[PDB]
Symmetry: D2
Subunit: 295 residues, 4 copies
């Protein structure tokens, strides 16, 4: 009855916190966690997935490392003391673990990818016969408005624009947590104190990860990646629009931009659910309430 | 007569038309010439519309010339429907827009302000073909672009989209640029009450302006944008020259995308200073709407 | 014997390349996988199976690959190669099944279990090869080199600037050329010199076995703005180069594939006069001893006696 | 005589093109304007003035043009040349070109042997004068390999946007690219022939041509092919084809894409020179050099 999900990510503090949120939610059955490279080198992102799973006592979840660089371009949890990995990744690549999971699943699986789209694009292009086994792809990346890496582009998308465009043109429903929503999903100093007052080793780690992070004029720090998991858990916390998104791969000034046809100016059929607002307090409540799982 | 000397390049177009009305009712401004760009209409039509507006406004003394027939490297894509306008009673000068612009610069004793409220085609031509006159251009004030969402394609505003290369030439020119994009112009809405205020002013020109606002809103009320009233784009350029204190603006780097698969014509504004790039533009981002409406109605009294 | 992986989109010349490879005991064909380009992926796969049926090598593992280019829609070399993709001669129906997996999977499996580096020969669009490279960076060390048919230093045969295989999937080809693995390129520069004249096709037909018959009837089908004396035979130059590199003249140069141009998508940009900074990444074939090439083919056709 | 406008960036070969044009009474050179590419715009202007001083044609009006490409960033060593004895006109190249067209009674031929910057400016800013332009004869581009980047010839690469403007203009274009110019080589023996003609001008021309991976037998003479094609088109083989200039590629900015095998829908927009009778080209030059006897 739980929703089967594949998590692909590049921890990264917010990826890490998204893993914590997912494993505290019995509505979700995390089938595997695979690592992309962007926030760090692929050796480090893999290591970080293994450390998080060690911390959270879920060494039963299969892990594989993915692509070592973006498709056509060149190419992490400081703060708290984290455990050394006590287990090994699977002897195969992220795409292979993803494909394997799809093949053997009896119902469609949800992909949540919160690093660059590199591994997800590879799976899509290399396994067209498994597209039917993918319910939807939930991403953290992009920005309808101003980017955070270049003027037009958010980092995840900018690191591998081609991979992202492959995802959005794939024919599989996409849900997009871009900067428009994640910038609203701020954790204020008081919130971080709330998480820390919960009083278990994990809520402590989450609070310290957050401590570390601390021209945009944010009141507190945005928490990007957990917005993907939070939307699956409580979509009613979010406002979203169904629109066409294209990713720029050629521009002189705009490589990696997510072009969102908000006012229907193109002929293009919508391919994405674009998150545009969140109930910030509700988002904090969800995170604070699920942290009680590690009591 | 120490008014600010200005060159107006435009593609009327109801809002260009209203910009002309505002400028000629402002003795702070000395309009040296009006030239026509093509965008809102064919170049025959935009030229004609400049001539009709000057005929209406009893300023047949301002020299007019037609400009480029198409964007620098792309194909082109009455223009003042609604009110009855007069037929032209005077002829454009026997030259091109670029030639009239250059002439004006050469013979001006002080730098001239360019206001271009159509595509940037003529301005870019003047810039590239007269580098020895850059010193005679104080600044270029444009209506075009959007820091946020575009009104023509998802990423692009119309004027820039029609001639991205010309706009990039303007912004890379080294001459200070002032940009009235959709971020401010979409705030500069004329509500139905405002159009009634203009109409109550009671002279042939305020009547024309109100009827121009009439036609627009009746036939082009944007149902997806959720505007309370119709945005008045072009007059924001003139208003900023008249009362900059009505506006909020930031000094940022702006690039125009000329190569993107999805983004041709986008004005990329480096709002959060993420690039290395030296600011080249003053980007208007807010306006005091009521004050903007007040300016228009105060200046419409000129035609009493 | 040199272990090779063959990735191809038959297509008459791919087919004749298969024939040549299987008549050469210098080469150990480890698998044949199918790309889409010349035809739909259903048809290319079928035609690999038909050729292996014909040549009684049903022991070679076959798998179908990617159904479309990485980031573009499929276009096919439709009426050039006709209906089935191998029109002309009667061919046998497949008597065996492809492996239960994708081309990239069979490729990876082959590399993993090989004891020495494997040579990839790819004679359709580079789609499967690029997928293997990006998804298996830990197996690059098991790839000796990639030998392609594609590209043109001069004029293209599909658009003014581009050759078909490259044009169908420029992004795949650029991935191959940027990969760090040695590339050998049989482009139109050489393949347009590797013409089979009517006399040569008559020679193949005179060899008198079922297979040389099929190869001759295949060429028959492939027969005026180019002003060729007879028909260029593109794909078998990859295998010929592995068999007898002394037939060929080649230069080591930098090659880039254009993925963004308005007029030039799919161009192979070859830095023939060293004008760029760029480190050579390819061996580009630029000439062939045509008669020697024809001799090679005919000599190896005797294998099917 | 055929009225022509010469826009160029001397440059030794532009210089030799000027020499040939002024020795040809079939041609009426209406004006010479300077582009920037081979050198800075100050230098190219100066060189036009030096050449016309040398050749005793200070009566031909000269103007300096654009100081850089339309959208991008931006010369006669060897022989002793005279200092300029006259001044350029007090206007820009585009102005002098427009003025020339306006006051011509019949269409004018434009020969542009530098980047196409001034010609593109003329075309875009004077659409009412297109009818006064018979054709634009250019030295630039390559159907085959480039001499500047792998895909691109210099003149075109310097201002790809100006070149694409010219080719998309609707005015007939004639293209002397590397395909023909690399065949138009001057061998050591030819340079000695020129030198033996025995006047100050043939001497200057020789001292220029006097001064590796391409494997040329002698030096290609690029710009004079434009003037030669006007004088003796029968020396050349050419094809009527569609030509587009790449202005966006990652690796191919400045490439002239010639649709030699009719693979696009596109209407031909250009006469593309593909061969030359080299000896006949050399004979034309030697023959015309006698003008300065
Ligand atoms: C700053 C903060 C966080 C990130 C990472 N990139 C996405 C948001 O842009 C998230 O997935 C973060 O892991 C990147 C940057 N540059
Ligand atoms: C819609 C609304 C207004 C215009 C015209 N272009 C600018 C705003 O985009 C203004 O200068 C209007 O003249 C054009 C369109 N297409
Ligand atoms: C036309 C279109 C496509 C082909 C195919 N593509 C390459 C040569 O361009 C070869 O690998 C042929 O299979 C061949 C021809 N003649
Ligand atoms: C090398 C580089 C540049 C030139 C100049 N560029 C054009 C052809 O390439 C000619 O007009 C030469 O003047 C000539 C040789
Ligand atoms: Ca992340
Ligand atoms: Ca306008
Ligand atoms: Ca093939
Ligand atoms: Ca030159």
């Amino acid at each position: 009855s739980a929703l089967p999900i594949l998590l692909d990510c590049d921890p990264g503090h917010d990826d890490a916190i998204a893993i914590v949120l997912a494993l505290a939610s019995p509505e979700l059955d995390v089938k595997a966690i695979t690592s992309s490279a962007g926030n760090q080198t692929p050796e480090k992102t893999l290591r970080n997935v293994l450390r998080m799973l060690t911390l959270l006592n879920r060494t039963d979840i299969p892990v594989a490392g993915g692509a070592v660089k973006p498709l056509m371009r060149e190419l992490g949890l400081d703060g708290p003391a984290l455990p050394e990995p006590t287990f090994a990744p699977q002897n195969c690549t992220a795409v292979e673990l993803m494909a394997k999971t799809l093949r053997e699943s009896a119902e469609p699986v949800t992909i949540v990818s919160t690093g660059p789209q590199t591994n997800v694009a590879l799976l899509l292009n290399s396994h067209p016969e498994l597209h039917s086994k993918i319910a939807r792809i939930v991403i953290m990346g992009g920005a309808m408005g101003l980017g955070n890496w270049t003027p037009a582009a958010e980092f995840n998308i900018y690191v591998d624009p081609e991979a992202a465009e492959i995802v959005f043109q794939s024919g599989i429903p996409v849900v997009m947590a871009g900067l428009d929503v994640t910038h609203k999903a701020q954790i204020h100093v008081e919130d971080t104190e709330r998480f820390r007052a919960i009083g278990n080793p994990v809520s402590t780690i989450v609070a310290e990860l957050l401590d570390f992070f601390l021209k945009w004029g944010f009141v507190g720090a945005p928490l990007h990646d957990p917005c993907t998991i939070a939307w699956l858990l409580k979509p009613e916390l979010f406002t979203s629009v169904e629109r066409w998104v294209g990713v720029e791969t050629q521009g002189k000034y705009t490589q990696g931009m997510t072009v969102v046809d908000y006012y229907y100016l193109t002929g293009n059929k919508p391919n994405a659910t674009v998150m545009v607002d969140v109930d910030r307090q509700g988002f904090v409540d969800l995170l604070a309430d699920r942290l009680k799982f590690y009591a």
